[PDB]
Amino acid sequence: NTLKLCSPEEFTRLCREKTQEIYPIKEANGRTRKALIICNTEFKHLSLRYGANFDIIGMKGLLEDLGYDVVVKEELTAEGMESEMKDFAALSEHQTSDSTFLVLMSHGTLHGICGTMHSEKTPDVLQYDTIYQIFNNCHCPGLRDKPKVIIVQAARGGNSSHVEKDFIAFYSTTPHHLSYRDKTGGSYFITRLISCFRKHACSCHLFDIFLKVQQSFEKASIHSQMPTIDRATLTRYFYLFPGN
Numbered sequence: 001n002t003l004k005l006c007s008p009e010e011f012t013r014l015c016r017e018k019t020q021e022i023y024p025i026k027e028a029n030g031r032t033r034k035a036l037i038i039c040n041t042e043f044k045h046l047s048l049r050y051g052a053n054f055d056i057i058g059m060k061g062l063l064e065d066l067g068y069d070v071v072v073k074e075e076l077t078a079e080g081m082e083s084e085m086k087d088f089a090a091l092s093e094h095q096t097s098d099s100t101f102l103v104l105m106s107h108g109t110l111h112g113i114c115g116t117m118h119s120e121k122t123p124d125v126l127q128y129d130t131i132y133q134i135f136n137n138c139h140c141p142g143l144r145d146k147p148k149v150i151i152v153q154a155a156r157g158g159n160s161s162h163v164e165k166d167f168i169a170f171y172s173t174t175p176h177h178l179s180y181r182d183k184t185g186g187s188y189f190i191t192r193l194i195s196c197f198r199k200h201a202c203s204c205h206l207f208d209i210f211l212k213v214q215q216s217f218e219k220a221s222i223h224s225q226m227p228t229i230d231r232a233t234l235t236r237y238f239y240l241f242p243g244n
Contacts, residue, residue, distance in 0.1 A: 001195075003065035005243030006202040014239060022205075023147055023236045025098050027244060028067060032093035033100075035068035038084065040075055040106040045119035046159065051185020052105055055153060058186070059103055062194045066201065066240055068101060069093075077115035078126040085134045094142030099238070101149045102131065108154030110175060128152075128169075132231070138162045147238045149206065153187055155179055168238075169230040170210050180222050189227055192216050206238035 014022060037060060041052045060070045073084045085102070094100065107114040112125035137144050143166075150169040158178035172179040172189035181187050196213050204212075207229075214227050 035101040054186040055190040089140040105153040110157040
């Protein structure tokens, strides 16, 4: 419904009692949190992703209610996705932010996300691996020691050096499986993620929220779809303290 807010009190208490178990938060005055959504709907050779727009609008609304200014880029090739993420990684405003969310929504393969021109004769895939190199500590100084949260809405095979740390990835389903949409076309993963954030971001850290999303797919099955936490290297709890 609406994003529920953390009291200033509960904010200040947790930042004081658990200072070394929590990611530090910037107060909103000079804060410039940034978030990126990449979504491909139409494809040169692959089925249309009807309803993807509902997921964009829902997740842009969630991120804004959590204090992020949201960049949305749509219908990209793999090369274009690479280019936008590098431009996004280099943005001044990460210096005055405490975190980021990367939301990727397209057709997917086992190890990558598809661009608009992808086909098995004309492969146009961005490896998920490449995301980690673009945003790591070496190549994105603005987000060092800050949580980089990746949300991936995609099928996962159903299309018929220096330190890496402070990442978490939340995939809509498990490897080799598909993700499903309701009769209006909205993704179940996105719909339940949004409502779970809106109820619990005020009092739960990120990993606890992800887990409640996964519990809902056990309590209310959707075929074999099970959101998956992947390649997680967070070193502290990530509280959002909405409203602060």
